[PDB]
Amino acid sequence: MQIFVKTLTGKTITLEVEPSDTIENVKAKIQDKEGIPPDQQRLIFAGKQLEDGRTLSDYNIQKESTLHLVLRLRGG
């Protein structure tokens, strides 16, 4: 479903969940959507970080919930 991924942008941004999705299926669906690249993100999945190999079922994941979707440039 559409997790209320309210990252550093400032709204409560949305998604379309994959119960066997990508390890950053939300990351791709936002990196297209928000714009910041899908390798320079980081989402606080309930308090832990997202495990970018396994998809968002591993989080005990929900629908409409809020990932803490921030990101900083290591190269910068």
Binding site: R72, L73, R74, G75, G76
Partner: protein, 367 residues
């Protein structure tokens, strides 16, 4: 032949009549001089039991000069006997005797493996060997005329104790401060017998992170010789521990820690050309969170980064790209000290070109 002698000595050596058994044990321990055959076979039932109570103690009185110039394997065997047979309280002084006699520390690692088998099955069997290696260094060896096995055994006894380590650290830096056997032989240990010190790799690392944020002159300057000598010729899996110590430990370390990290990465990227590959990204990650540098501290960061990124052909790619990117990142627009950090980085990179399309990169930096 002694194969049959030591053969029957093995089986009777624990399970034997014990009334004439301990007497006949003392009979062979009266015969134990003429050969080094009965040394090990006695030492099994002189690891199990005592054919006499000070029969054991007199036999261990045989044990001190019992192996002054012994062979390799007779080293571990006669050491197991010469220490752990009957380790009394005053057997601590027993330890000191051996430390004078056969401890000139020298296949060879197998020789180290037998030395370790004895020294470390005893290091955690009876605690007195802790006090024993303490008196082996701190009494009269960890100051005056040091054995390389002194440093090795300190790796074993003076660093590798379960709870006998706090004063193990006290004597560990004790002559480690007054120049009692200083790090000029630390290269000799951390070069010649590596995994003989390397299995205690967490101990080398405890020496780094504690005796390396140090404040004595040549103790600090010898502890930085450890992380130097360690992360070069060690194994390439803890080298992430070296180059994540000389990187992140110099990240939030100190004025002293940041100087140590700049100098660590500097001794790496200078004294080691190739090994600066594998951990390149970690120092790249310490190349971001820059809230402590003067034009020599931030310039030291960029001096290291460019010290590697402009050095290899096929390997400079993601580094150099992230480099130009970071320079344009901060020193493109602005931050409270950000433009200072940027211009410093840009100049430092031009020093990287100060050695070519890097003139194009200097065009990019003015860009």
């Amino acid at each position: 032949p002694v194969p049959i002698q030591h053969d029957i000595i093995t089986s009777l050596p624990e399970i034997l009549e014990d009334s004439q058994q301990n007497e006949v044990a003392r009979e062979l321990s009266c015969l134990l001089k003429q050969g080094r055959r009965l040394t090990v076979p006695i030492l099994d039932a002189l690891s199990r039991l005592d054919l006499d109570a000070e029969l054991l103690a007199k036999v261990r009185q045989s044990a001190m000069t019992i192996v002054p110039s012994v062979k390799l394997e007779d080293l571990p065997v006669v050491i197991k006997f010469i220490l752990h047979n009957v380790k009394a309280a005053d057997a601590v002084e027993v330890i000191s005797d051996l430390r004078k006699s056969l401890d000139l520390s020298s296949t060879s690692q197998n020789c180290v493996k037998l030395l370790f088998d004895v020294i470390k099955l005893a290091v955690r069997f009876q605690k007195d060997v802790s006090e024993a290696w303490i008196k082996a260094i701190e009494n009269s060896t960890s100051v005056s005329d040091h054995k390389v096995l002194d440093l090795i055994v300190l790796l074993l006894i003076h660093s590798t104790n379960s709870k006998n380590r706090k004063q193990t650290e006290k004597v560990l830096r004790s002559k480690i401060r007054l120049g009692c056997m200083p790090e000029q032989l630390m290269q000799n240990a951390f070069q010649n017998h590596s995994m003989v010190i390397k299995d205690f790799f967490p101990s080398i690392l405890s020496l780094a992170q504690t005796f390396l944020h140090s404040a004595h002159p040549a103790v600090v300057s010898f502890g930085s010789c450890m992380y130097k000598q360690a992360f070069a010729v060690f194994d390439s899996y803890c080298q992430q521990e070296v180059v994540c110590a000389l990187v992140t430990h110099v990240c939030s370390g100190n004025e002293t820690e940041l100087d140590i990290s700049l100098d660590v990465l500097t001794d790496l990227v200078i004294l080691h050309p190739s090994l600066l590959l594998r951990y390149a990204t970690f120092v790249k990650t310490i190349l971001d969170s820059m809230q402590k540098l003067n034009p020599c501290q931030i310039r030291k960061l960029f001096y290291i980064l460019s010290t590697l990124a402009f050095s290899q052909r096929q390997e400079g790619s993601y580094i150099q790209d992230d480099m130009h990117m970071v320079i344009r990142k901060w020193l493109s627009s602005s931050v409270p000290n950000h433009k200072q950090m940027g211009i410093i980085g840009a100049v430092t990179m031009m020093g990287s070109v100060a050695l070519i399309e890097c003139d194009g990169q200097l065009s990019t930096l003015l860009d």
